[PDB]
Amino acid sequence: KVFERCELARTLKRLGMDGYRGISLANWMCLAKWESGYNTRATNYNAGDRSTDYGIFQINSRYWCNDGKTPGAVNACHLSCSALLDDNIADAVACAKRVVRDPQGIRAWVAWRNRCQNRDVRQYVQGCGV
Numbered sequence: 001k002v003f004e005r006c007e008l009a010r011t012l013k014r015l016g017m018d019g020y021r022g023i024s025l026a027n028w029m030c031l032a033k034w035e036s037g038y039n040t041r042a043t044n045y046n047a048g049d050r051s052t053d054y055g056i057f058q059i060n061s062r063y064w065c066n067d068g069k070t071p072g073a074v075n076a077c078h079l080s081c082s083a084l085l086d087d088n089i090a091d092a093v094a095c096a097k098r099v100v101r102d103p104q105g106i107r108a109w110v111a112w113r114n115r116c117q118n119r120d121v122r123q124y125v126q127g128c129g130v
Contacts, residue, residue, distance in 0.1 A: 003038040006128035013130045017091045021100045023084035030116035032056050035071035041085050055084035057096045064095055
């Protein structure tokens with residue numbers, strides 16, 4: 001599923017992501033935008049280390065979900081990576097909440113640093129009613 005901007009914003013709010021571990025909604029929105037274009041089926045294979053990024057938040061198979069083919073990986077979210085490719089983002093949101101409970105928080109995603117940190121991210125939720 002390819003979410004529309006405001007549709008996603010309202011979904012993420014109901015799922016309790018606004019202010020989760022100190023992270024504003026707009027920041028989550030900026031992260032989904034740059035990681036997958038708001039696409040829940042996006043996947044990106046990292047030939048360099050043999051892991052794959054899955055879903056709307058591009059969650060990595062080395063630590064977060066199990067895909068069986070990543071060497072030396074763990075599955076902190078206790079999910080199959082297939083779960084992160086569903087049109088319903090419930091499991092993807094629960095896993096993203098897990099990723100940010102670790103020290104780095106949202107900084108775990110480099111694209112957030114490049115494209116969202118220290119920027120005016122208000123545009124991502126503007127006019128959406130959240």
